[PDB]
Every structure is written in structure tokens, then in C-alpha cells.
């Protein structure tokens, strides 16, 4: 699944 990550998906 080539889904885009949410704005905050990479924040702790």
C-alpha cells in the first residue's frame, strides 16, 4: 500500500 503519511506521522 503506497499511502501517504500524515502531517504528524513522523513526530514523536
Amino acid at each position, epitope marked *: *500500500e503506497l*499511502l*501517504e*503519511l*500524515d*502531517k*504528524w*506521522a513522523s*513526530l*514523536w
Partner: antibody
Amino acid sequence: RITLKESGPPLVKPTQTLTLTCSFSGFSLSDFGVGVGWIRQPPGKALEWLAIIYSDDDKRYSPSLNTRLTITKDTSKNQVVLVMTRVSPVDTATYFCAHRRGPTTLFGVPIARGPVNAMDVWGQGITVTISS
Amino acid sequence: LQLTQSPSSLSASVGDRITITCRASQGVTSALAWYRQKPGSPPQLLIYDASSLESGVPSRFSGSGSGTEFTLTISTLRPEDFATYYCQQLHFYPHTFGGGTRVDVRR
């Protein structure tokens, strides 16, 4: 203290353009990382995510409805607008706007993702019917 | 991405303890919210970030899970709890809601 309210026409004819406005209070779209999203609910059915716009003018759309959708903001009026072109009767639904928190910040530093993972306050909803 | 809620419907009585499940087709970390919706009203947030209790929300509500399996729990059902519940994932775009779980008065 946060309130949102949808406005627009209750009836639109097929092929026409629907413009919905969210008017809010108790927060500012200048708040770092704040979002305003749109969600709809066809009669008798479940919630369906439509779009979201952020303080930085970052926006995202439903893939299935994305050619018909535009989302805009005026941070000084405390309003967000959703435009949906070429409406058709499938588009009959209750439309909600909603607030998304920005992350926890400490003296301006984002220190925690948590709080962003919900839509925390919703507007009451506006019923829109599409019919000729 | 698919979010699957189960059951779709369930019967219950005041004072009951109920458990609603949400599974994601792929991992969404902790980015999962639960809402209650009463007929004629907008959804109301119960739980954010999978397990965090929203301010002002009665303590009977709780949530658990991370990755793909999530559960909402109402420890003691109150009259206001006969309603429909939805989960939503906010880890990927588009954000997606589950199909809903109707909770009615058993007889």
C-alpha cells in the same frame, strides 16, 4: 470554548458547484499545526473523510473525490471553505467541519504528537441535498 | 487502508460492560480515535491517540491497542451510551473512519 459552524445552501442541482463555509471560534488558524477538516455523512450511513487544511496552507483530499474538491482558508476571518464541483445525488449528506489540534509545544517547540490524533471538536452539521 | 469495526451492532443493558474493536489493514501506530454519535448530533470525541482520554469525557470510557488492533471499552454503560461509535485512523491520508458500531437496548 471552541465552536464551529457550517453554512451553505440546503439544495443544489446536479452538475452545480457546492460551496460550504466553516466559521469558527476559540482557536486561530494561525495556531501552529492546527487543522480544519471536513467529513460527511450520507443518510443512514457512516462517516466519510473529505479533506483537511492546515495553518501552513498544507492541504489534503480524499483520493476518490479529489478532482472535485478544493479547500481554502482565510485565517483572519476564522473561516474555511470547501468547494465541491459537479455535484450529483450521491453527494447528498450531512457535512461537518471539525478542528484538529496541533502538537504539544513547549515554548513553541513541538514536543509531542499525541493530541493531533483525533478531530476533537465538531460543528453541528449542515444537510445538503442534491436534486434536480 | 481499511478500518474494520466489529461488531456492527450489539445489544446491551444499562450497567453492562462493552467492548468494541477496530482493526486496520496495516499498522497505524497509535493514530486512532474513537467517537460517539447520538442520532441527530455530530460525533463526539472519546479517545485520541489510541488510549488517551479526552478532557471532559467520563472515566468509564477507555481505549487500548497500537499498530493494527484497537478496542474501545465502556466499563459501565449509561443511557446516553446507546448510540453509534466510530473509529478513525489519522496515521495515513486519507484519514479513514470505520463503518460504525450500533449499540441498542437489549430485550
